Amino acid sequence: QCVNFTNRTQLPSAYTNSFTRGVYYPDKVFRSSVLHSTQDLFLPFFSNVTWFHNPVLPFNDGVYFASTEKSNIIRGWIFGTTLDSKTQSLLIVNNATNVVIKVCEFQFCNYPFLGVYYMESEFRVYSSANNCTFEYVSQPFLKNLSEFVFKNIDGYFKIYSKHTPINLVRDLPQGFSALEPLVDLPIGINITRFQTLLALHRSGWTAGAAAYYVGYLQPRTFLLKYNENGTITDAVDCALDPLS
Amino acid sequence: ETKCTLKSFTVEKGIYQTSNFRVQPTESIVRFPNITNLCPFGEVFNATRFASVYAWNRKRISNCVADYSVLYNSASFSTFKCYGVSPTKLNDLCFTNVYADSFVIRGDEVRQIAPGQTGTIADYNYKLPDDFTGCVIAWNSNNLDSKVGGNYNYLYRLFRKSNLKPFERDISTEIYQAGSTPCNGVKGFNCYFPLQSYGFQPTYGVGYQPYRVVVLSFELLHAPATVCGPKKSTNLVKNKCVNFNFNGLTGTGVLTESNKKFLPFQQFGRDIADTTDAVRDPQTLEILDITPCSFGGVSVITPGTNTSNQVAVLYQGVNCTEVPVYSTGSNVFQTRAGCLIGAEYVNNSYECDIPIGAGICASYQS
Numbered sequence: 001q002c003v004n005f006t007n008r009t010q011l012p013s014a015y016t017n018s019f020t021r022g023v024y025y026p027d028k029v030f031r032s033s034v035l036h037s038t039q040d041l042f043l044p045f046f047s048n049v050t051w052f053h054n055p056v057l058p059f060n061d062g063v064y065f066a067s068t069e070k071s072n073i074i075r076g077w078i079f080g081t082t083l084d085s086k087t088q089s090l091l092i093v094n095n096a097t098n099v100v101i102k103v104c105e106f107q108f109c110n111y112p113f114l115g116v117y118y119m120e121s122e123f124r125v126y127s128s129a130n131n132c133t134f135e136y137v138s139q140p141f142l143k144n145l146s147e148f149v150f151k152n153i154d155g156y157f158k159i160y161s162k163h164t165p166i167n168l169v170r171d172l173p174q175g176f177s178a179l180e181p182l183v184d185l186p187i188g189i190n191i192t193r194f195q196t197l198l199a200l201h202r203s204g205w206t207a208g209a210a211a212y213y214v215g216y217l218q219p220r221t222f223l224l225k226y227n228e229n230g231t232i233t234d235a236v237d238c239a240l241d242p243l244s
Numbered sequence: 245e246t247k248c249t250l251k252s253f254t255v256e257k258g259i260y261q262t263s264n265f266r267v268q269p270t271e272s273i274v275r276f277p278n279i280t281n282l283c284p285f286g287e288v289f290n291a292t293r294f295a296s297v298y299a300w301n302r303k304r305i306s307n308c309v310a311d312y313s314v315l316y317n318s319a320s321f322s323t324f325k326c327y328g329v330s331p332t333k334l335n336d337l338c339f340t341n342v343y344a345d346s347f348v349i350r351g352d353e354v355r356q357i358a359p360g361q362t363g364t365i366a367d368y369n370y371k372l373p374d375d376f377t378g379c380v381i382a383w384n385s386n387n388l389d390s391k392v393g394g395n396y397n398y399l400y401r402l403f404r405k406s407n408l409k410p411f412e413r414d415i416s417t418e419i420y421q422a423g424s425t426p427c428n429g430v431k432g433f434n435c436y437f438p439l440q441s442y443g444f445q446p447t448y449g450v451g452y453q454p455y456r457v458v459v460l461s462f463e464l465l466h467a468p469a470t471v472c473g474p475k476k477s478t479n480l481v482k483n484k485c486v487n488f489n490f491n492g493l494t495g496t497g498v499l500t501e502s503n504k505k506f507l508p509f510q511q512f513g514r515d516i517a518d519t520t521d522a523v524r525d526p527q528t529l530e531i532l533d534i535t536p537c538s539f540g541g542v543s544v545i546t547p548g549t550n551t552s553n554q555v556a557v558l559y560q561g562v563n564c565t566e567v568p569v570y571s572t573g574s575n576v577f578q579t580r581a582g583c584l585i586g587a588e589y590v591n592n593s594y595e596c597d598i599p600i601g602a603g604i605c606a607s608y609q610s
């Protein structure tokens with residue numbers, strides 16, 4: 001039901017600094033006022049994070065996404081290998097109500113999208129879903145900063161999240177904030193490349209203000225500090241400087 | 245024991261270390277989170293009605309707890325036959341998900357549903373491979389599906405050139421061509437309807453009544469499992485050296501209540517050198533503390549074989565509450581060095597004779 005588009009929009013992709021953001025809880029273990037050294041797959045300190053103003057991007061090990069979001073125009077996510085009926089494709093949709101997740105051989109078009117009819121009902125991202133097994137529904141997820149980490153380990157999709165109110169204009173702030181685990185999916189797919197949904201006004205799609213940050217993860221060793229309450233308050237990257 | 249370890253028939257005055265004491269665990273406890281998200285079986289077994297046998301209703305069951313105890317122990321089911329796995333251990337064994345096939349067949353057709361079976365239902369309606377794992381449950385539905393005027397809502401496939409492959413539904417309404425004369429989609433000289441409707445009535449005899457049958461098949465593809473039976477959770481006992489199995493993690497110790505403040509997602513804590521030191525019960529969400537069961541060495545205080553034969557016993561670093569032949573013995577003293585049995589504490593003070601520890605020591609007078 002989704003068709004071609006003539007206005008070949010291009011996103012003004014710039015670069016900026018990652019600073020010390022993107023730290024999550026690696027395990028469900030409580031610890032109190034200690035310094036624990038852990039070797040895992042993180043976002044290296046002071047890295048090169050890409051900024052966008054629906055491009056195709058690789059997944060690699062894992063993907064860090066951030067948005068100083070206004071009005072939550074961005075809605076969903078697509079994951080998979082080929083994003084067609086030939087391979088299982090994971091789909092996530094978050095609207096103002098109960099959010100939904102599927103894994104089906106969705107046959108996406110060249111420009112899949114939701115579309116909003118202004119009382120709203122428009123959903124033509126895919127065209128067919130014939131063979132598929134798993135489905136899922138859960139509570140709603142979401143000017144203000146929202147940070148998400150997406151990982152996939154041994155048949156286990158993993159979503160970590162964090163939210164903060166922010167007042168800085170453009171760049172990432174010089175702050176520290178650990179990321180709590182949010183959702184796990186014990187389903188095995190070969191996800192290696194993903195997408196990003198948009199809520200365009202269809203009645204002529206009007207989607208021009210789509211700014212968000214994307215970064216990639218690598219394996220390395222960190223040193224985390226736990227306070228009395230067992231919340232991560234500081235971290236040190238081992239392979240950064242001689243001092244580190 | 246002192247003579248044996250020292251390897252002599254004479255013992256000089258002193259204190260000697262002979263063996264070790266370790267408290268033993270009493271019983272086992274296991275706790276698991278609340279049983280919830282029951283698999284949707286009642287809505288299938290005891291629904292309004294069932295689908296036809298050639299159009300059998302297929303359901304996929306995943307992400308739920310599959311309680312089979314009430315299913316197996318239900319006495320309202322006419323036939324409950326499991327081929328692949330033992331019904332009694334179904335609460336233990338589990339595959340990643342389940343398939344349900346529900347339909348209505350005549351009473352005589354119940355035995356037709358089995359691996360390696362041939363028949364109208366067994367060939368033209370549904371087929372089961374000889375490697376099938378799962379169960380078949382059949383029950384009477386004469387009071388529900390059979391109609392006094394004749395139940396014609398259920399049909400079975402009777403005319404087909406070839407038998408159905410296992411796990412396949414044929415809904416094609418092509419008119420079977422009995423002879424060599426092709427028919428233009430209708431019956432005729434050598435053509436008839438492949439599907440035949442039932443004539444179920446309450447007046448029908450044994451085996452002629454409508455029976456609702458559900459076949460459950462278990463499949464365990466390499467994807468992580470979602471369907472498993474309920475797990476029994478025992479009760480918890482505090483202040484007793486026991487061995488526990490909290491939500492899959494096992495350990496031995498005394499289990500007390502603790503005031504630590506966890507965080508709404510982290511389950512259990514640990515202190516240093518990777519030793520478990522706190523757990524949260526999945527049932528009540530309370531922060532409990534764990535302490536290893538007591539142990540220590542034992543020492544024998546003697547004044548010398550030449551003098552006497554009575555001795556005292558010291559349990560090192562052991563609380564003077566669970567000591568237990570000297571379960572009671574003489575008066576029992578508690579000191580920073582442990583617990584002392586066979587000696588009495590006086591208020592005097594002399595030169596030290598047999599060093600005990602923490603500033604105290606013993607001598608012979610008793």
Ligand SMILES: *[C@@H]1O[C@H](CO)[C@@H](O[C@@H]2O[C@H](CO)[C@@H](O)[C@H](O)[C@H]2NC(C)=O)[C@H](O)[C@H]1NC(C)=O
Pocket residue numbers: 227228229
């Ligand atoms: C650990 O968490 C506790 C609980 O929130 C913090 O103690 C609170 O501090 C605020 C600010 O003074 C008080 O209003 C609350 O009454 C305190 N709650 C208590 C004592 O239960 C504590 O500050 C935290 N530790 C840190 C931040 O290091």
Ligand SMILES: *[C@@H]1O[C@H](CO)[C@@H](O[C@@H]2O[C@H](CO)[C@@H](O)[C@H](O)[C@H]2NC(C)=O)[C@H](O)[C@H]1NC(C)=O
Pocket residue numbers: 278526527528529
């Ligand atoms: C586990 O199930 C019980 C259901 O019995 C939940 O609530 C219990 O409700 C009874 C009656 O209202 C109370 O007497 C119990 O104290 C409740 N249990 C607890 C642990 O508070 C119980 O909440 C469920 N467990 C969780 C973690 O939600």
Ligand SMILES: *[C@@H]1O[C@H](CO)[C@@H](O)[C@H](O)[C@H]1NC(C)=O
Pocket residue numbers: 015016017047048
């Ligand atoms: C990020 O990459 C761009 C080009 O790839 C480069 O010009 C820029 O210097 C990089 N940023 C940092 C902080 O090195």
Ligand SMILES: *[C@@H]1O[C@H](CO)[C@@H](O)[C@H](O)[C@H]1NC(C)=O
Pocket residue numbers: 093094095096097098099100
């Ligand atoms: C959107 O909201 C509606 C209304 O509750 C509901 O279908 C669900 O929560 C959402 N559906 C989709 C497809 O996002």
Ligand SMILES: *[C@@H]1O[C@H](CO)[C@@H](O)[C@H](O)[C@H]1NC(C)=O
Pocket residue numbers: 130131
């Ligand atoms: C699913 O795939 C099988 C091949 O493995 C095919 O025979 C079947 O028709 C497919 N089902 C659907 C609904 O597309």
Ligand SMILES: *[C@@H]1O[C@H](CO)[C@@H](O)[C@H](O)[C@H]1NC(C)=O
Pocket residue numbers: 143144145163164165
């Ligand atoms: C952004 O998210 C934070 C996290 O809860 C919330 O406090 C804040 O109100 C949100 N921003 C707006 C404009 O609502």
Ligand SMILES: *[C@@H]1O[C@H](CO)[C@@H](O)[C@H](O)[C@H]1NC(C)=O
Pocket residue numbers: 188189190
């Ligand atoms: C992912 O790819 C590997 C190698 O090509 C394959 O063995 C595996 O089965 C694939 N995963 C799934 C879920 O099919």
Ligand SMILES: *[C@@H]1O[C@H](CO)[C@@H](O)[C@H](O)[C@H]1NC(C)=O
Pocket residue numbers: 007008009010207208209
């Ligand atoms: C094309 O789309 C971009 C953003 O999607 C917008 O900025 C631009 O004005 C559009 N151009 C036309 C001709 O529609």
Ligand SMILES: *[C@@H]1O[C@H](CO)[C@@H](O)[C@H](O)[C@H]1NC(C)=O
Pocket residue numbers: 286287289290318320
């Ligand atoms: C029939 O199914 C209903 C579904 O709610 C259930 O309540 C009832 O106990 C069932 N009857 C049995 C198991 O005999």
Ligand SMILES: *[C@@H]1O[C@H](CO)[C@@H](O)[C@H](O)[C@H]1NC(C)=O
Pocket residue numbers: 550
């Ligand atoms: C015990 O001691 C006394 C005096 O010290 C000595 O005469 C005697 O032989 C000793 N007996 C033994 C068995 O050592």
Ligand SMILES: *[C@@H]1O[C@H](CO)[C@@H](O)[C@H](O)[C@H]1NC(C)=O
Pocket residue numbers: 589590591
């Ligand atoms: C030693 O003296 C204290 C205080 O005078 C008294 O409480 C204690 O009972 C005395 N010890 C004995 C063995 O009587």
